[PDB]
Design a binder for these strands. Structure first.
Ligand SMILES: [Zn+2]
Ligand SMILES: [Zn+2]
Lengths: 110, 83, 93, 88, 99, 148, 99, 82, 109, 95
DNA sequence: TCGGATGTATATATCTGACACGTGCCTGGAGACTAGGGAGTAATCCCCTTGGCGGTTAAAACGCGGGGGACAGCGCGTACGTGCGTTTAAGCGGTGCTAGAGCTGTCTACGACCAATTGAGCGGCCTCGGCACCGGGATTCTCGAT
DNA sequence: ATCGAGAATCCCGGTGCCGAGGCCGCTCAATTGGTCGTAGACAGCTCTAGCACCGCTTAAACGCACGTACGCGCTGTCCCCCGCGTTTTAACCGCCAAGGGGATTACTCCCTAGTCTCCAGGCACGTGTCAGATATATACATCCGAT
């Protein structure tokens, strides 16, 4: 990229690679920080955020709501079988729980 | 300021909805007493960590940021309250 | 007063990039901000530990790739490393 | 209703559908294009620009990425093109 | 001839209605008072803020829901539907959260 | 691999579909390096201006976007010193299904209505933003001097 | 008359003897063969040494000892003395790695 | 090529490791399930160790990378340096 | 105490201070490290090690062995309830298991 | 060439063991166990102190930081005993 | 099978507070230059790790008789679900106080940082005794006959 | 309840061994002493919200009555792991070989921290506009007793 413009635009991403680089420097993680690490980290963060937002938007469209709410995020995280593994030990505020019912607890078929 | 009688303030129907959200349908009477002890230990641990952080931080007003730190440190991290 | 730091505009921007219509709420924005911060902290701490392991002192892209390979599950990590490689390739050229 | 070869060419490299993959938007693309797309492109649909990465990760384990039914159809009705394109 | 529901059906309706919703279950003021009780036990003349106790109650809700789900599993293991204390101690022991 | 077939199909398409007010093709025997001759749109400060472009097709074409540089020097907010174009499809929003026709439509619509928000040469974009009409005369004179 | 011990007593003898000892209970060569199998499935032409193989073997034994403690607790809660598979996956689910 | 030697962790070996846990009687078909859980844990820890090795351009994995693999896994181990 | 000697000697400790001070310096924990931090941390580890070693030695003396073995360490960790909570997650090399059988596990006449 | 010099806490833990038990031997396995244990505890306390200092935008990890860290990571009895021991050590050093 | 009673879902106004958008600005991000020290790379050497027999052999594998036990079924009294009338306090709004969180100018002493150096600390050698291994003897459950 | 033969287990005496501990030499990391930029205590001022009350309304909890689903205690069954004896087999120790890459050192080079100067991107703030909660008003799937 020969464009000597803003580094986020130079990398073609949306998250601020400059702010990420600053946080790496002032985080007290290592004495030196490579110039390519912030781009990689911002790309990973942007991908994760984008896929969370996509799945939450799908949940909201299922709910016929045009405004993402923590319930949508909770449903998105628990519905996915590996985002759960990533964040199962974690708790989302005001998100509730996934709708599940034990088979035995169902009423007797009469 | 004198204040007492904490744990029995919680209502048995509150534990009822908590179990209902858990998904269990039939509840014994002995559950309500031990649930109170569970809340005892959980709350005492969490706010002990919180007050430790606050007293370290020259501050005696326990903020939400500190309790979020306590939950994160215990591995029961909570979201939606900053950080 | 003071100037608080947040990722609200970036999450909104990527949302509009991926969903042109659906809006966002304040609580959901807070959840997203804190989640990005948590993932950042996890990845960066793992990378710092990796750099300390090899007696190194510089956090380069390879350490970030290794950290994201460790943390995220299989194909999520695969997609993340593919995205990172594409981003660094675009940055270089 | 069996489509002709032109309808059975992919939308990118103009070659036939081999191991076709069906997108939720009912878009089909021959398998090597999809491989070199999803990992080496913008993760979006080559037709409607929709982000279909979630579908890919959902279907990768169960091998439901490839559309088996239309692959069987084209193999029954157009096998020689598949044999020709086997070697790229 | 009152329409006395059979034991369980309205229970399942109530399950669904509180399971589809995310509204807070523990009552506000009693929980806040209890939290202040334990805090002033640990440190006298201590002052809180609303957001802190909100987060505390959300964490308590999550912990209780998870524990009660684990209780569901361990109780239904014994071919029972009535959850006993033994379910609670077994669930807390498997997680190893009581040291 | 299939890149040769893709190039053959693209040249066949441009043979059947010559772009409006423009044209393109192979500069020679090589397939990666191609030459394009375009004519400036009437609804633009480059009325009737003729411009040349050299295009390098990459190995991973069509998946990697080809790189295009204007052969003639153009003084445009979206044209740099070496003639490159700051357009989204060129490096970022590139889509393999897009042919030369649609990208040429995009570039002609960009040239007809220049955008100084994301330029390559700052001074000309700034003077265009301050006063578009002096920029109109200067660009008209320049595209008159070198394109004729 | 041939002498046959009552089943369960020698079970307890084995339990006490093994709880008293600390030696490895898995044969090292089969374990390293499995380790190399997953290694070659993960990267061809990879090299180990004895110390690392011991480390994985002892981590395996510790993890399985913990899992079997938990499944014994589940089985005894289930009014049984025999551990069943359902106990195994239930104890895994409560521990919080599969869900 | 080595394949299908999971029987190395065999009937008496898994029985003895169970008896270490305090069980008296065990159903005869838990062996496949415990072999499966042993497997999945094994390739998890092996993934971690081998990628730790990959990071260092190292052609061999040592106990050090795997003990940090356990460290991150939440199964901190003692007795091999740290 | 004012003295010109090793910090461990002047502080009346056994664990090194300069070494811990350097480890804090080059361990990537802070831009600046206080002077009392290394001595305090060394004292904390000093107490921990003293307690664990004395408990392990008592356990070994109970087992009539005067040379410590990792089994003695494992018994020291697990017999105490508070320190077991402190070290719940860790696994001891060659540690074995605590001898214990549940009450209902024992057979009946 | 020369072998790179390595580090261990062997001599110091040996001194402590002899101070608390003048007739007790220690094997190499348990010796390495103690080395790993002290390294792990040091890492835990230092990481907690650094995290607390960053959580309070403080650039210096003073003794109070480790005081809070040990008060937290250690249960009641060990927490108070270690706090007392550390205060004794620091006051002896500064006196 | 079955028809009301129940809750659930659907159609529509409206009004509300929250979300999206425009502005000021100002501090964090960006571009240029320098130095150097940390990292990449070439050379080597040697520790150990793979590999291989080969003998021994404890332990895995299999058969088999059998007895403890998971599982299937019955009843029965009980605690628990369900509904209702009642009481209680939880929640909402509104006021007032001030104590403490938070921001600001600042001075100072705690500590970053470098030359000298030396002795504590570490690598290697040597020595004996705590303990492993073995054989034998005495002590502790144990299971069948009462 | 009992005792006796039989294995199973702790214990004593002996012998050997290898590694735990003490001693020596040497190198480099800790210590001394000095300088100097700077995080941080610190007194002081602002202003935000948390406590406490206070009145009120009404939704939720309580105590009780009542019918009953089932938890569980018990009984009966056949079936499926256990113990033990007998057979095979790969584990296990011991040995030796090759080389390979782990580890170490020396050389070079270029990436990045650090400083300086410059600028616009994002945040605080205010304000317009509508998504949907709320409220009311309809229609339908379903429960259970009744058939
Ligand atoms: Zn194709
Ligand atoms: Zn599409």
């Amino acid at each position: 990229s020969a464009s000597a413009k803003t580094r986020s635009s130079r990398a073609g991403l949306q998250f601020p690679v400059g702010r990420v680089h600053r946080l790496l420097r002032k985080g007290n993680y290592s004495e030196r920080v490579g110039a390519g690490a912030p781009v990689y980290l911002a790309a990973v963060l942007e991908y994760l955020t984008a896929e969370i937002l996509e799945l939450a938007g799908n949940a909201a469209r299922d709910n016929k709501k045009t405004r993402i709410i923590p319930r949508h995020l909770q449903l998105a995280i628990r519905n996915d079988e590996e985002l759960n593994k990533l964040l199962g030990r974690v708790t989302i505020a005001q998100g509730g729980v996934l709708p599940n019912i034990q088979a035995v607890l169902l009423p007797k078929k009469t | 300021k004198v204040l007492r009688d904490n744990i029995q303030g919680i209502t048995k129907p509150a534990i009822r909805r908590l179990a209902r959200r858990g998904g269990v349908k039939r509840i014994s009477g002995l559950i309500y007493e031990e649930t109170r002890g569970v809340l005892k230990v959980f709350l005492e641990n969490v706010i002990r960590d919180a007050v430790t952080y606050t007293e370290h931080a020259k501050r005696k007003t326990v903020t939400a940021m500190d309790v979020v730190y306590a939950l994160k440190r215990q591995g029961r991290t909570l979201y939606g309250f900053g950080g | 007063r003071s100037r608080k730091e947040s990722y609200s505009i970036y999450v909104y921007k990527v949302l509009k990039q991926v969903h042109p219509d659906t809006g966002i709420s304040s609580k959901a924005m807070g959840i997203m901000n804190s989640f990005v911060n948590d993932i950042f902290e996890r990845i960066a701490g793992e990378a710092s530990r990796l750099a300390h392991y090899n007696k190194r002192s510089t956090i380069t892209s390879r350490e970030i790739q290794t950290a994201v390979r460790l943390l995220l599950p299989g194909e999520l990590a695969k997609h993340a490393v593919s995205e990172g490689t594409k981003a660094v390739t675009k940055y270089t050229s | 209703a069996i489509p002709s070869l032109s309808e059975c060419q992919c939308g990118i490299c103009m070659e036939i559908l081999v191991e076709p993959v069906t997108l939720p938007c009912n878009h089909t693309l021959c398998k090597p294009c999809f491989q070199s797309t999803v990992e080496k492109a913008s993760l979006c649909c080559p037709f409607c620009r929709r982000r279909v990465s979630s579908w890919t990760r959902y279907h990768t384990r169960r091998n439901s990425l490839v559309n088996v039914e239309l692959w069987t159809i084209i193999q029954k009705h157009y096998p020689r093109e598949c044999k020709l394109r086997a070697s790229g | 001839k009152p329409h006395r529901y059979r034991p369980g059906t309205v229970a399942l309706r109530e399950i669904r209605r509180y399971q589809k919703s995310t509204e807070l279950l523990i009552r506000k003021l009693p929980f806040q008072r209890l939290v202040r009780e334990i805090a002033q036990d640990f440190k006298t003349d201590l002052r809180f803020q609303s957001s802190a106790v909100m987060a505390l109650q959300e964490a308590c809700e999550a912990y209780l829901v998870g524990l009660f789900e684990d209780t569901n599993l361990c109780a239904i293991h014994a071919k029972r539907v009535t959850i006993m204390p033994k379910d609670i101690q077994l669930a807390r022991r498997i997680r190893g959260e009581r040291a | 691999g299939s890149a040769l077939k893709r190039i053959n199909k693209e040249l066949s398409d441009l043979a059947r579909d010559p772009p409006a007010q423009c044209s393109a093709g192979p500069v020679g025997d090589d397939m990666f390096h191609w030459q394009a001759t375009i004519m400036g749109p009437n609804d633009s400060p480059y009325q009737g201006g003729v411009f040349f472009l050299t295009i390098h097709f990459p190995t991973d074409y069509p998946f990697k976007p080809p790189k295009v540089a204007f052969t003639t020097r153009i003084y445009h907010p979206n044209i740099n010193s070496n003639g490159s174009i700051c357009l989204d499809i060129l490096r970022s929003q590139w889509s393999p299904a897009l042919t030369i026709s649609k990208v040429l439509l995009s570039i002609c619509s960009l040239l007809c209505d220049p955008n100084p928000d994301d330029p390559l040469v700052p001074e000309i974009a700034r003077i265009y933003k301050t006063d578009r009409d002096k920029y109109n005369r200067i660009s008209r004179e320049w595209t008159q001097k070198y394109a004729m």
